[PDB]
Design a protein around this ligand. Structure first.
Ligand SMILES: N[C@]1(CO)CO[B-]2(OC[C@@H](O)CO2)OC1
Ligand SMILES: N[C@]1(CO)CO[B-]2(OC[C@@H](O)CO2)OC1
Lengths: 196, 196
């Protein structure tokens, strides 16, 4: 799991300073290993950045997908998926920030062409994740557990809203897992159940 | 309204290229006036950026505040305010992007100290706007038109969600005002009424 520890540290370093100003030294500092070991596993700073994005998307899919196939109505499955999405965002916040840095710099003139192409290619992971939510929203409309709404718009809205927790959420030293689930549950109650 | 036209164009230019790579020439191109006229009204690119942020916040407050004091329950007023917020976002999208660029670069090491201080000072406009929504959410809980929830968390969530329309929304050449209100209304129905 040396590679995984490097990615964990890189996620936090990129979140702190952004891709441009983050350096390998910053990451070697965060992970507490040498530049030599980092370069054994990775070719460049940008290679680490892409790997963080990919791993972040892997981790959230692996956490959320089981809830999409468990027994439940569309509403029940959507609620469980959404709570899992937010628990992942809150507990793997650096990975979340790096995914969205990647999306933002997908067209950065500061990058080489191959680098923009690599970030654009990762959009497919995000699109496939969104398809999973859109299917469940469609199913919840069909089983009557969700209000009849535009499936695509509901999907884009829900995912934008879940991710928008990143506007105000920050990690807290002593915050417990049970407490992160409570907070995630409070937000999802508002997103799915509404304010009215 | 020469000054207003410059701000309109600057908002669109900053939205297109960001603060760093936007230039006065870009703005003079967008507005279709000379650099001389722009410098008559403004001292620098950063001065224009601050003015766009301020004007964006002025415009949204002036549109939304009347709905906060019209007759209605907390739910009714919150719905009207939220629709107005989204109509403003969709119709004044460049101003919205500049406000959030300002918030993001509030701590940019690329800026002089005075520039970060000026952007931090503008946070007060955003805080005062949020207070108006938090009051109405509290009132809707008190009049029973909204579900009992944490007022602060509901406020941060709702505003984050309304703004998160910017993830997917783009201006469309022939999009009508009546159609923008319809789309805004569809989103707000989901935000306030929920998906369930
Ligand atoms: N929060 C994520 C992991 O950190 C990153 O952003 B997102 O947004 C919706 C996309 O469909 C998948 O990518 O959800 C997972
Ligand atoms: N969309 C705005 C105007 O463009 C910009 O962002 B915001 O977010 C919530 C803040 O309380 C006020 O600032 O709402 C208004």
């Amino acid at each position: 799991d040396v590679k995984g520890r490097i990615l964990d540290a890189a996620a936090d370093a990129f979140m702190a300073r952004g891709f441009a100003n983050t350096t390998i030294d910053d990451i070697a500092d965060e992970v507490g290993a040498t530049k030599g070991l980092i370069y054994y596993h990775f070719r460049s700073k940008f290679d680490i950045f892409l790997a963080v994005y990919e791993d972040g998307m892997r981790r959230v899919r692996e956490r959320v997908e089981p809830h999409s196939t468990a027994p439940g109505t569309g509403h029940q499955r959507l609620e469980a998926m959404s709570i899992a999405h937010l628990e992942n965002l809150m507990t793997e916040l650096g990975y979340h920030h790096v995914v969205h840095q990647g999306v933002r710099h997908q067209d950065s003139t500061a990058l080489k062409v191959r680098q923009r192409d690599a970030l654009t290619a990762l959009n497919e992971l995000r699109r496939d994740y969104e398809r999973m939510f859109r299917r469940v929203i469609a199913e919840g409309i069909a089983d009557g557990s969700l209000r009849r709404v535009d499936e695509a718009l509901a999907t884009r809205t829900l995912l934008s809203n879940l991710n928008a927790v990143d506007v105000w959420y920050r990690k807290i030293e002593g915050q417990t897992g049970e407490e992160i689930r409570e907070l995630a549950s409070q937000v999802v109650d508002m997103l799915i159940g509404g304010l009215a």
